[PDB]
C-alpha cells in the first residue's frame, strides 16, 4: 500500500536531502582552503604521534 | 553556508511538485526547519567573521538579519493563505515561488563577500517584489506603486554600480576583507565627494531617507500582506547593512559629508512622526512609523560610533519584528471589513479581546517600553547622539513624545470607544491569526532576555 | 512568391553579408553591400501592399545613398594612398565619410528616421531579418576599422542614439515601432564601446540578437502587432505572455537577468579608460527603455485586460507552425548571467 | 567581423588586386612600384601601431 | 580595439589551438557544466510548456537530448575560455619579464616607519 | 504641503513631465523623406565642419 | 568649431569680462543657428519670412543666454577675487536660466532653468578643475 | 556537548581566513598588473596584444617589369 | 444595452465558520485545516521556539568573555604585585616605532 503514500509524500525528503548535500558541499569547499593548516604563528603546533592533520 | 542556501532551492521544486491541497503545509514546515537550521549562525566570535568560503561569509551583523529573514518566510506563508484561497493552484505556486526566490536572494545578499555580487543580489531582490506588488495587489494604484518602487531604487543604484567598478579599477579588489584591511583615507576633492555620493545614495534611498521616501507609502500600502511584511521588516534593512559595510572606505569625508543627511534625518523624523498624528489610513501610519525609525537608524549609522552601531543593529531587528506585527494586525481588520480607514471599525476590544491584547503589546513595543530591544537600540542611539552633540537631546526627546502619542492614538482609535453599529460581520479571531501574533511577539521578549545576540559586531 | 525564389533571395542576402565579412578588398565589401541590398529589397515586399512598397522605397533610397558615400570614401582613401585593403583608413575626411555612411546603414542617430518607418511597414518576419541579420556587416566593418575611428563623432552618435531611442520608444503603441526604437538604443550601446573594445561590441550584439529573436518569435507566435491585440493573449495562452514578460525584464537590463551582462560589462570597460560621466548618463537613459518595457509588461502579463467572445473559438485550436528555436532563445535571453566569463571565448 | 577564410583555405579570392606592386599582367609596373614595395617591406610583421612611426 | 586578433601564430578559424592541449581539461562534474545542463533542462521544460504538453513528463528523449546538447557545447566552450585566460596570463607575465624597467620592485616599508595621518571620529 | 505636493513636484513629477515632453518632440515626425533627408544633409555638413576639420 | 571654444577658454577667468562675454555670445549664436537649421528642416515654416523669424528668435535667445552667462560669471569671479571656484559658474548658469525664462516669459521655466543650468555650469567648472573627460581617449 | 557536536575549534576558521585573504590579495595585485600591462601594450604596440594587420610582403612581384627602373 | 461590458458580479465573502464551526482559519477542508494547525503549532512553538531558545542560551562562549576576564585578572594581579601601572597610554612599544628625523 506504500505506493500511494510514497507518491503523495515523497516531496518531504527534498529539503533534508538538500541540507545534507549542502553540508557535504561545505566540507568540499573547506578542503580547498588548507594552504595554511597548522601554519599560522598563533596555532602552529607539533603533531601527535598518531594524528595526521590538525583539522579537516 | 550552502547548508542553508540549498534547502531553499529545494523548497522550490517541493512546492512545484506538491499535491494541490498540501502546498501550504509543506512550505511552512520546511521553512520553519530552515529557520531552525539558520539559528546556528548566532554562534559568532569576538575578533573576525565566519569565512565559510571565497564567496560567502557570516558576521555578527548579518547573522541576526539572516535569522529574521528565515523566520519571516513562514510567517508570510501563514499570513498569505487566507486571501489567496480562491486562487488557482498554478498561481498559488507562483506566489510561493516569488516568496522563496526573495528569501534566496536576501540570504545570498546578506552573506556575499564581494561588493559587486552584493550589488547584483541586492538589485535582483527587486524583480520578485515588483511582480508580487503589481500582480497580487488589490487596487489600481499598485501599478503606479510598482513604478515608484522601481525607478526610485534604480536611479540610486545605477550610479553606485559605476562607483563600484571604478573602485575595482583603483584598488584591484572589491572583496570586503581586503577592502577593510587595505583601507586608505579619502581626500577632499570634488571627485571624492561625488564618489562618496554615488556610494551612499543607493542605501540612503533604500532606507528611505526623508525627502527620498515617497515610494515607501505607495509600496507598503498597495502591496499584499506578505509583500508589506517583507518590504518593511527586511528590505528596508538592506540600506542599513549596505551603509554599515560601505562606510569603511569613506572616512574621513563622512566627517563633514553627513551634515545634510543628518539634518534631513532628524528633522524628517520629527516630520514623519507628526504626519502619523493625522493619518486616515492605518497602513500609511505604520509606513510613516517605519520612516521615522529608519531615520533614527540613519543618524546612528552616520555618526559612526560603536554605541551608535550597536543601537542601530538592535533597532533594525526590533523594528522589523514590530512593523511586521503591526502590518499583520491591520490586515486582520482589513480582511474583516474590506476597508483601510482607521475610524471605520472602532471599539474592537469589546468584540475581540485577545486581538486587543495583541494590539496593546504591539503598540507598547512600538513606543520603546523598557526593557524591550526597541528601547535598547533607541537609548544607545540617543546616548551616542548626545555624545555627538548635547543639543540633539531636544529633537530626539521630541520624537520620543510624538511616537507615544500616535502609537496610543492608533490603539485608542481602533480598540476603545464604542463599536460601529452597522458593522456586523466581525467573526471571532481564528487560531491562525492568534498564532501569527504569538510567533511575532514571543521572539521579541526572548531576545530581550539575551540582548547581546542582536547588538552587532561592535559588542 | 515562389518558395525556391524566396530561398534564393534569402541565401543571396546571407551571401552578401558573408562577402562583406570575409573580404580584404574594399571593392568586394562594397559589392557585398550592393548584393545584400539588391536581394533584400524584394524580401521586404513579400506581402504586397502600399505600406510594404513605401517601406521598400525608403529603405532603398537610404541604403543607396549610404553605399554611394561608402564608395566615395573608398575612392578618396585610394587617392591619398594607393591601398585597397581594409585597414587604418589613411585619410581623415574619407574616415569621416565612412563613419557617416556606416551609421546611416545601421540607423544610428541622427540617421535613425528610416528605421521605425521601415519596421512598421513590413511584416514581422521581414522586421526580424532587418533588425537582426542586417546589423552584422556594417558592425563588422566598423570593428575592422575601429583603431582609426574618431571617438568624438562615434560617441556623439551613440549617445544620441540611446537618447532618441528611449524618447521615441516612450510614445509608441505599435509593437514594431517599439522594437525599432529599442534597436536604435541598443545600436547606440554597441557603438559606444566600439572605440575601446570590439569584444564588448560582439558580446552586446550577440545578446541583443538573442533577445530580439526571442521577442520577435513570441510576437509571431501570438499574432499581435499592437498593444491591444497583445493584451488579448493572456486569455488564449498565458505561458507565452509570462515568458514575454520575463524577456521584457531581461531586455530592460535588470539583474540577475542576462540582459544585464552587456551594459554591465560595457560600463566596466568604459571605466578602465577614464570615461566616467558617459556610462552614468547611458544608464540613466536606459531607464527609459526599461520604463516602456515595464508598461508593455503591465499591459500584457501583470494585469488582465478585457477579451472578446469569439476568443472562445480560438480555444479549440492549437498553433500549427512550430518554431524549434524559441525555447533555447528564451533560456539564453534570461538565464545566462552566471556564464558571464565565457565572453573570453569571443576575443 | 573579419573571418579570414582565404588565409585558412589558401584561396586568394581578392588579394591579387589589393596592392599596386602585385604581379600585373605582362609585368607592367606601376608608377610608384618601388616606393610601395619599400613601404610594404618596412612595415611587414611589426603591427600597425609600430609601423605608423 | 582588439587585443588578441592580431596575435602572431593565430590560425583564423580554429576555435581550439594545439597549445590548448597543454592545459588540464575541465572536469565533467564542473559546476559550470552542471549549470549548462540545467539550462538544457530548462529549455526542455519551456519546450514542453509552449507545446501545451505535460511540462515535466511529456518528452523524456527530447529533454535528455536538450541536456546532452547543452552539456556537449558547454564543455568545449569552457575549454576555449580557459585557454583564452591562460593565454592572457602567459602574455602578461612574458611582457612583465621582458620590461623590467616598467615594473620596479621598490623597497618594502613596515608600518612602524610609515607616517599615517589619524582622523579622530568625534 | 511637503509630502503630497512639493516632494512629489521636484523629483518624480518633473522627471515624468520632461520625459513626456521630449518623447512628444522626438517621435512626432510626418514621415516625409524630403524633411529628414534635408536633415541628413545638415548633419553631414555639420560632421565635416565640426569633427572632421579638427584632427 | 573648437575655435570658438578656445577663444572663450584661453582668457583667464576673472580678466577681460567684455571679451569673455563676446566669446560666449558667439558660442550661443552658433548653437542657436544649428538648432534653427534642424528645426526648419524637420518642421517647415510654410513661409520664407516665418523661417527667418524663427531663426532670428532662436539665435537671439541662445546668444542672450550665452552673453548673460559669460558676463555674470566673469563679473562674479573678478569681484570675489576667487577664480577656479564653481560658485561663479553656478551664478552665471542661474543668470542664464533666468534670461531664458524671461525670453520665454514663464516663471517655471525660469526657475527650473536657473537651477539646472547652475548645476550644469558648476559641474563643468569642476570637470575643468579636476580633469574629468567627457570623450575619453582609449588607453587600455 | 553543543561545541563538540556542532562546531570546530577556532584554528580552522583562523587558517581558512588566512588562505582566503592570500587568494584575494594575489587576485587584486594581478588585476592591477594586468591593467598596467594593457596600458603599456596599447601605447607602444610592441607586445603580442593590439597587433594590427599590415600588408603581406609575399604579395610583391620581384620580377623584371618591362622597364629597367620598375 | 446601457452597459459597458459582460462581467461576473462581485461575490460575497465566505465565512469559514459556517461549514466548520471549529475551523482554525487555515483551510476549508477540516482535515487539512486541522493538520495545518497541528504542524504550525508543533514546528513553530515546540521545535523552533523552545528548543531554539535553549540552544541559544547554552551556546559555547566563542566571544571569549570569560577568557578575557581571567586574562585581566592575571594581568591585574601581576601588575599590582610588582608595582607597575595597571595600564599604559601606549599600546605599542616605542622601540619599534621610527618617527621622522626632522620636525622643522
Ligand atoms: C536562482 C536559483 C535557482 C533558480 C533558477 C530560476 C528559477 C527556476 C528556473 C526557471 C525555468 C524552469 C521552469 C520553466 C518552464 C516552466 C513553464 C511553466 O509554465 O510551468 C508550468 C508547470 C505547470 O504546468 P502542468 O504541470 O503541465 O499543469 C498545470 C497547467 O499547465 C496549468 O498551467 P497554466 O498555463 O494554465 O497557468 C497559467 C500560468 C502559466 O505561467 C507560468 O507557469 C509562469 C512560468 C514562467 C516561466 C519563467 C520564464 C523563464 C525562466 C526565467 C526565470 C527568472 C528567474 C530569476 C529571478 C526573477 C524572478 C522572475 O500563467 C499565469 O498564471 C500568469 C501569472 C503571472 C505570474 C508572474 C510570474 C511569471 C514569471 C516568474 C518566473 C519565476 C521563475 C520560474 C518559476 C517556476 C515556473 C514553473 O510547472 C511545472 O510543473 C514545472 C515546474 C517544476 C519542474 C522541475 C521539477 C524537478 C524534478 C523534482 C526533483 C528535483 C531534483 C533535485 C535533485 C536532488 C535529488 C533529490
Ligand atoms: C562632400 C559631401 C558634402 C556634400 C554637400 C555639399 C554640396 C555643395 C554643392 C551645392 C550645389 C547646389 C546644388 C543644388 C541642390 C538642389 C536643391 C533643390 O533641388 O531644391 C529643392 C528644395 C525644394 O524644392 P521645391 O519643393 O520645388 O520648392 C518648395 C519651396 O522651396 C518651399 O516651400 P514653402 O514656401 O512652403 O517652405 C517655406 C520655406 C522656408 O524657407 C526658410 O525657412 C529659409 C529661411 C532661413 C533663413 C536663413 C538664415 C539667415 C541668416 C543666417 C546666416 C548664417 C551666417 C551669419 C551668422 C549670423 C549673422 C549675424 O521653404 C522651406 O521650408 C524649405 C527649407 C529649406 C531651406 C534651405 C535648406 C538648408 C538647411 C536649412 C537651414 C535653415 C536656416 C537656419 C540657419 C542655417 C545657417 C544659414 O528647394 C528648397 O528647399 C529651396 C531652394 C534651394 C536652392 C538653394 C539651396 C542649395 C544649398 C546648397 C548647399 C548649401
Ligand atoms: C527635503 C526637505 C524639503 C525640500 C522640498 C520642499 C522645499 C523646496 C520646494 C518648495 C519651494 C521651491 C519653489 C521654487 C520656485 C517655484 C516657482 C514656480 O513654481 O513657477 C511656476 C509658477 C507659474 O507661474 P506662471 O504661470 O508662469 O505666471 C503666473 C504667476 O503665477 C503670477 O505671478 P504674480 O503676478 O502673482 O507675481 C509674480 C512676481 C511677484 O510675486 C508676488 O506677487 C508675491 C511676492 C513673492 C515674491 C517673493 C520674494 C519677496 C519676499 C522674500 C523675502 C525673503 C525670502 C525668504 C529668505 C529668508 C532669509 C532670512 O514674482 C516674481 O516676479 C519672481 C521674481 C523673483 C522674486 C522671488 C524670487 C526670490 C528667490 C529667493 C532667494 C533666496 C536666496 C537664498 C537665501 C538663503 C537664506 C535662507 O510660478 C508662480 O506662480 C510662482 C511665482 C513666485 C515664485 C518666487 C517664489 C520664490 C520662493 C523661494 C525660492 C527658493 C527655493 C528654491 C531653491 C532653488 C533655486 C536655485
Ligand atoms: C506556559 C507558557 C505560556 C507562554 C509564555 C511564553 C513562554 C516562552 C518560552 C520560550 C522558551 C524559553 C526557553 C529559555 C531557556 C532558558 C533556560 C536556562 O537558561 O536556564 C537558566 C537557569 C539555569 O541555570 P544553569 O546555568 O543551567 O545552572 C548552572 C549551575 O551549574 C546549576 O546550579 P546547581 O548545581 O545548584 O543545580 C541547580 C538545579 C538543582 O538545584 C536544586 O535542586 C536546589 C534548589 C534549592 C532548594 C533547596 C531547599 C529546598 C528543599 C529543602 C527540603 C528538602 C531537602 C531535605 C529533605 C527533608 C525535608 C526538610 O536546578 C536547576 O538546574 C535550575 C532549574 C532548571 C530550569 C531550566 C529552565 C528551562 C526552560 C525551557 C522551557 C521553557 C517553557 C517553560 C516550561 C518549564 C516548566 C514549567 O534557569 C533558571 O531560570 C534559574 C532561575 C532560578 C534562580 C532563582 C531566582 C532569583 C530571583 C531574584 C530576582 C528577584 C526580583 C523579582 C524577579 C522574580 C522573577 C523570578
Ligand atoms: C530631496 C532630498 C534628496 C537627498 C539630498 C542629498 C544632499 C546632497 C548635498 C551634498 C552635500 C555637500 C556637497 C558638496 C560639499 C560642500 C558644499 C559647498 O557648499 O561647500 C563649499 C563649496 O564652495 C562653493 O559652495 C562651491 C560649490 C557651489 C556649486 C554647487 C551647487 C549648489 C546648489 C544647490 C542645489 C541643490 C542640490 C540638490 C539637488 C536635488 C566648500 O568650499 P570649497 O573649499 O571651495 O569646496 C570643498 C571641495 N574642495 C576642497 C575640493 C575645494
Ligand atoms: C545570450 C547568449 C549568447 C550566445 C551566442 C550564441 C551561442 C550558440 C552559438 C554556437 C557557436 C558555434 C561555433 C563553433 C564552430 C567553430 C567556429 C570557430 O572557428 O569560430 C571561432 C570563433 O569562436 C567563437 O567566437 C566562439 C563562440 C562562443 C560564443 C559564446 C559566448 C557568449 C558570452 C557568454 C554567455 C554564456 C553563453 C552560453 C552558451 C550556450 C573563430 O575565431 P576567429 O576567426 O579567430 O575570430 C573572428 C572574429 N575576430 C577576429 C574579430 C575576433
Ligand atoms: C500565557 C500566560 C503567560 C504568563 C505565565 C508564564 C509562566 C512563567 C514563564 C515566563 C518566564 C519568565 C522569564 C524569567 C527569566 C528566566 C530565563 C533566563 O534565565 O534565561 C536566559 C537565557 O535566555 C536565552 O538566552 C534567550 C533565548 C534566545 C531567543 C531566540 C528566539 C528563538 C528564535 C526564533 C526566530 C528569531 C527571530 C528574530 C531574529 C533575531 C539566561 O540568559 P544567560 O545570562 O545567558 O544564562 C546564563 C547561564 N547559561 C549561559 C548557562 C545558560
Ligand atoms: C532617486 C534619486 C536618487 C539620486 C541618485 C543620484 C545621486 C548620485 C550622485 C551622482 C554620481 C555620479 C558619479 C559617478 C561615480 C563617481 C566615481 C568617481 O569617483 O569618478 C570621479 C569623477 O567624478 C565624476 O566624474 C562625477 C561627475 C558628475 C557627472 C554626473 C552628474 C550627476 C548629477 C550630479 C548632481 C547630483 C548629485 C547629488 C544628488 C543628491 C540626490 C538627489 C573620479 O574620476 P577621475 O577622472 O579619475 O578623477 C581624477 C582624475 N581626473
Amino acid at each position: 500500500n506504500v505506493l500511494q503514500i510514497v507518491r503523495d509524500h515523497w516531496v518531504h525528503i527534498l529539503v533534508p536531502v538538500g541540507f545534507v548535500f549542502g553540508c557535504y558541499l561545505d566540507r568540499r569547499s573547506d578542503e580547498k582552503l588548507t594552504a595554511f593548516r597548522n601554519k599560522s604563528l598563533l596555532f602552529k603546533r607539533e603533531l601527535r604521534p598518531n594524528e595526521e592533520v590538525t583539522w579537516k | 553556508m550552502l547548508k542553508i542556501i540549498i534547502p531553499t532551492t529545494m523548497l522550490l521544486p517541493m512546492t512545484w511538485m506538491s499535491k494541490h491541497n498540501m502546498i501550504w503545509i509543506n512550505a511552512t514546515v520546511h521553512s520553519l526547519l530552515i529557520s531552525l537550521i539558520s539559528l546556528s549562525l548566532l554562534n559568532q566570535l569576538g575578533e573576525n567573521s565566519l569565512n565559510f568560503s571565497l564567496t560567502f561569509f557570516s558576521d555578527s551583523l548579518s547573522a541576526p538579519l539572516l535569522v529574521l529573514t528565515t523566520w519571516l518566510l513562514p510567517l508570510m506563508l501563514m499570513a498569505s493563505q487566507s486571501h489567496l484561497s480562491k486562487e488557482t493552484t498554478t498561481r498559488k505556486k507562483l506566489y510561493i515561488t516569488m516568496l522563496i526566490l526573495l528569501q534566496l536572494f536576501l540570504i545570498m545578499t546578506f552573506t556575499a563577500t564581494e561588493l559587486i555580487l552584493f550589488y547584483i543580489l541586492f538589485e535582483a531582490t527587486l524583480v520578485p517584489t515588483l511582480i508580487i506588488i503589481t500582480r497580487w495587489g488589490n487596487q489600481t494604484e499598485r501599478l503606479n506603486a510598482g513604478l515608484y518602487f522601481l525607478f526610485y531604487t534604480l536611479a540610486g543604484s545605477l550610479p553606485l554600480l559605476v562607483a563600484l567598478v571604478y573602485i575595482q579599477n583603483t584598488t584591484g579588489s572589491l572583496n570586503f576583507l581586503i577592502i577593510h584591511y587595505w583601507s586608505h583615507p579619502l581626500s577632499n576633492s570634488w571627485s571624492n565627494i561625488f564618489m562618496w555620493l554615488a556610494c551612499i545614495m543607493a542605501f540612503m534611498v533604500k532606507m528611505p531617507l526623508y525627502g527620498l521616501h515617497l515610494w515607501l507609502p505607495k509600496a507598503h500600502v498597495e502591496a499584499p500582506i506578505a509583500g508589506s511584511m517583507v518590504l518593511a521588516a527586511v528590505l528596508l534593512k538592506l540600506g542599513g547593512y549596505g551603509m554599515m559595510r560601505i562606510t569603511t572606505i569613506l572616512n574621513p569625508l563622512t566627517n563633514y559629508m553627513a551634515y545634510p543627511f543628518l539634518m534631513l534625518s532628524m528633522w524628517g523624523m520629527i516630520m514623519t512622526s507628526s504626519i502619523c498624528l493625522r493619518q486616515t489610513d492605518l497602513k500609511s501610519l505604520i509606513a510613516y512609523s517605519s520612516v521615522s525609525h529608519m531615520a533614527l537608524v540613519i543618524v546612528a549609522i552616520m555618526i559612526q560610533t560603536p554605541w551608535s552601531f550597536m543601537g542601530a543593529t538592535a533597532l533594525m531587528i526590533a523594528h522589523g519584528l514590530t512593523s511586521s506585527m503591526l502590518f499583520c494586525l491591520a490586515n486582520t481588520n482589513y480582511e474583516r471589513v474590506h476597508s483601510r480607514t482607521m475610524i471605520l471599525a472602532r471599539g474592537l476590544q469589546t468584540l475581540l479581546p485577545l486581538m486587543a491584547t495583541w494590539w496593546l503589546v504591539a503598540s507598547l513595543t512600538n513606543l520603546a517600553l523598557p526593557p524591550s530591544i526597541n528601547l535598547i537600540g533607541e537609548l544607545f542611539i540617543i546616548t551616542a547622539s548626545f555624545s555627538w552633540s548635547n543639543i540633539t537631546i531636544i529633537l530626539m526627546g521630541m520624537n520620543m513624545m510624538i511616537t507615544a502619542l500616535y502609537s496610543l492614538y492608533m490603539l485608542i482609535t481602533t480598540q476603545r470607544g464604542k463599536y460601529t453599529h452597522h458593522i456586523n460581520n466581525i467573526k471571532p479571531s481564528f487560531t491562525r491569526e492568534n498564532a501569527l501574533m504569538a510567533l511575532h511577539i514571543l521572539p521579541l521578549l526572548l531576545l530581550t532576555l539575551n540582548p547581546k545576540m542582536i547588538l552587532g559586531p561592535l559588542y | 512568391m515562389n518558395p525556391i525564389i524566396y530561398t534564393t533571395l534569402i541565401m543571396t542576402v546571407m551571401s552578401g553579408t558573408m562577402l562583406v565579412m570575409i573580404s580584404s578588398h574594399w571593392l568586394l565589401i562594397w559589392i557585398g553591400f550592393e548584393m545584400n541590398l539588391l536581394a533584400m529589397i524584394p524580401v521586404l515586399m513579400k506581402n504586397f501592399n502600399p505600406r510594404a512598397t513605401e517601406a521598400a522605397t525608403k529603405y532603398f533610397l537610404t541604403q543607396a545613398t549610404a553605399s554611394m558615400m561608402l564608395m566615395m570614401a573608398i575612392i578618396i582613401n585610394l587617392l591619398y594612398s594607393g591601398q585597397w585593403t581594409i585597414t587604418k583608413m589613411f585619410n581623415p575626411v574619407a574616415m569621416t565619410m565612412m563613419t557617416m555612411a556606416l551609421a546611416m546603414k545601421l540607423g544610428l542617430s541622427p540617421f535613425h528616421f528610416w528605421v521605425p518607418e521601415v519596421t512598421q511597414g513590413i511584416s514581422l518576419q521581414a522586421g526580424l531579418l532587418l533588425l537582426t541579420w542586417q546589423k552584422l556587416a556594417p558592425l563588422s566593418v566598423l570593428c575592422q576599422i575601429s583603431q582609426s575611428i574618431n571617438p568624438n563623432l562615434m560617441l556623439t552618435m551613440a549617445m544620441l542614439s540611446i537618447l532618441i531611442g528611449g524618447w521615441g520608444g516612450l510614445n509608441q503603441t505599435q509593437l514594431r515601432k517599439i522594437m525599432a526604437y529599442s534597436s536604435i538604443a541598443h545600436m547606440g550601446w554597441m557603438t559606444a564601446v566600439l572605440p575601446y573594445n570590439t569584444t564588448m561590441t560582439i558580446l552586446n550584439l550577440l545578446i541583443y540578437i538573442t533577445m530580439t529573436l526571442a521577442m520577435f518569435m513570441l510576437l509571431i507566435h501570438s499574432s499581435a502587432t499592437t498593444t491591444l491585440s497583445l493584451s488579448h493573449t493572456w486569455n488564449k495562452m498565458p505561458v507565452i505572455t509570462s515568458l514575454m514578460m520575463v524577456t521584457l525584464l531581461s531586455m530592460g537590463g535588470l539583474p540577475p537577468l542576462s540582459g544585464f551582462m552587456p551594459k554591465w560589462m560595457i560600463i566596466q570597460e568604459m571605466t578602465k579608460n577614464e570615461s566616467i560621466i558617459m556610462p552614468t548618463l547611458m544608464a540613466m537613459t536606459a531607464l527609459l527603455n526599461l520604463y516602456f518595457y515595464m508598461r508593455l509588461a503591465y499591459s500584457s502579463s501583470l494585469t488582465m485586460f478585457p477579451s472578446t467572445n469569439n476568443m472562445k473559438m480560438k480555444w479549440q485550436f492549437e498553433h500549427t507552425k512550430q518554431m524549434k528555436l524559441l525555447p533555447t532563445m528564451i533560456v539564453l535571453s534570461t538565464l545566462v548571467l552566471p556564464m558571464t566569463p565565457a565572453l573570453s571565448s569571443l576575443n | 567581423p573579419f573571418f579570414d577564410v582565404q588565409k585558412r583555405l589558401g584561396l586568394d579570392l581578392d588579394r591579387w588586386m589589393t596592392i599596386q606592386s602585385a604581379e600585373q599582367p605582362h609585368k607592367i609596373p606601376g608608377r610608384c612600384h618601388a616606393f610601395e614595395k619599400e613601404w610594404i617591406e618596412c612595415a611587414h610583421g611589426i603591427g600597425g601601431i609600430r609601423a605608423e612611426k | 580595439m582588439t587585443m588578441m586578433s592580431g596575435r602572431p601564430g593565430r590560425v583564423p578559424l580554429q576555435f581550439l589551438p594545439n597549445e590548448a592541449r597543454s592545459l588540464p581539461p575541465p572536469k565533467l562534474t564542473d559546476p559550470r557544466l552542471v549549470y549548462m545542463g540545467f539550462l538544457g533542462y530548462c529549455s526542455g521544460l519551456i519546450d514542453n510548456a509552449i507545446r501545451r504538453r505535460p511540462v515535466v513528463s511529456a518528452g523524456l528523449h527530447r529533454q535528455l537530448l536538450y541536456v546532452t546538447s547543452f552539456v556537449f557545447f558547454g564543455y568545449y566552450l569552457l575549454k576555449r575560455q580557459d585557454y583564452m585566460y591562460a593565454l592572457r596570463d602567459h602574455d602578461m607575465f612574458a611582457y612583465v619579464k621582458s620590461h623590467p624597467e616598467d615594473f620596479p620592485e621598490k623597497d618594502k616599508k613596515t608600518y612602524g616607519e610609515i607616517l599615517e595621518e589619524f582622523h579622530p571620529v568625534r | 504641503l511637503l509630502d503630497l505636493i512639493w516632494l512629489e513636484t521636484i523629483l518624480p513629477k518633473t522627471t515624468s513631465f520632461i520625459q513626456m515632453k521630449m518623447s512628444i518632440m522626438v517621435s512626432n515626425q510626418k514621415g516625409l523623406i524630403k524633411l529628414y533627408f534635408l536633415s541628413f544633409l545638415i548633419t553631414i555638413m555639420i560632421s565635416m565642419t565640426l569633427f572632421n576639420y579638427h584632427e | 568649431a573648437k575655435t570658438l571654444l578656445h577663444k572663450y577658454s584661453d582668457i583667464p577667468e576673472g580678466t577681460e569680462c567684455h571679451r569673455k562675454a563676446y566669446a560666449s555670445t558667439s558660442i550661443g549664436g552658433a548653437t542657436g543657428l544649428i538648432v534653427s537649421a534642424y528645426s526648419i528642416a524637420l518642421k517647415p515654416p510654410a513661409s520664407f519670412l516665418e523661417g527667418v523669424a524663427r531663426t532670428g528668435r532662436y539665435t537671439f535667445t541662445s546668444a542672450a543666454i550665452g552673453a548673460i552667462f559669460g558676463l555674470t560669471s566673469c563679473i562674479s569671479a573678478q569681484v570675489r577675487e576667487k577664480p577656479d571656484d564653481p560658485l561663479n559658474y553656478f551664478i552665471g548658469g542661474c543668470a542664464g536660466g533666468l534670461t531664458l525664462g524671461a525670453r520665454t516669459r514663464s516663471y517655471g521655466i525660469g526657475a527650473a532653468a536657473c537651477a539646472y543650468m547652475g548645476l550644469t555650469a558648476a559641474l563643468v567648472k569642476m570637470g575643468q578643475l579636476e580633469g574629468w573627460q567627457v570623450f575619453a581617449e582609449p588607453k587600455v | 556537548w553543543i561545541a563538540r557536536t556542532f562546531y570546530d575549534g577556532p584554528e580552522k576558521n583562523y587558517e581558512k581566513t588566512m588562505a582566503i585573504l592570500q587568494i584575494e590579495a594575489e587576485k587584486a595585485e594581478l588585476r592591477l598588473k594586468e591593467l598596467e600591462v594593457r596600458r603599456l601594450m596599447r601605447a607602444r604596440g610592441d607586445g603580442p596584444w593590439y597587433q594590427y594587420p599590415t600588408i603581406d610582403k609575399a604579395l610583391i612581384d620581384h620580377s623584371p617589369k618591362t622597364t629597367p627602373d620598375n | 444595452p446601457t452597459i459597458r461590458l459582460q462581467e461576473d458580479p462581485d461575490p460575497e465573502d465566505e465565512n469559514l465558520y459556517e461549514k466548520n464551526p471549529d475551523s482554525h482559519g487555515y483551510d476549508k477542508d477540516p482535515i487539512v485545516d486541522l493538520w495545518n494547525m497541528r504542524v504550525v503549532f508543533f514546528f513553530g512553538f515546540s521545535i523552533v521556539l523552545v528548543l531554539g531558545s535553549t540552544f541559544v542560551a547554552y551556546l559555547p562562549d566563542y566571544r571569549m568573555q570569560e577568557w578575557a576576564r581571567r586574562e585581566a585578572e592575571r594581568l591585574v594581579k601581576y601588575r599590582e604585585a610588582n608595582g607597575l601601572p595597571l595600564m599604559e597610554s601606549n599600546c605599542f612599544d616605542p622601540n619599534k616605532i621610527q618617527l621622522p628625523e626632522d620636525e622643522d
Side-chain angles (χ1 to χ4, degrees), chain B residues 40 43 48-49 51-52 172, chain H residues 7 13 16-17 20 24 28 31:
Chain B
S40 67
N43 186 60
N48 73 322
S49 45
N51 312 120
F52 301 118
Chain H
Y7 301 104
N13 189 62
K16 278 180 55 184
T17 304
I20 289 166
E24 295 300 326
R31 281 187 197 108

Side-chain angles (χ1 to χ4, degrees), chain B residues 123-134:
Chain B
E123 230 59 62
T125 60
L126 304 193
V127 183
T129 319
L130 169 87
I131 286 170
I132 282 162
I133 291 169
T134 52

Side-chain angles (χ1 to χ4, degrees), chain C residues 261 335-343, chain E residues 31-33 35-36 39 78:
Chain C
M261 161 186 345
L335 317 163
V336 146
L337 200 80
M339 308 269 97
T340 305
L343 73 97
Chain E
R32 296 172 290 168
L33 254 184
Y35 192 77
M36 296 279 330
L39 291 185
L78 291 186

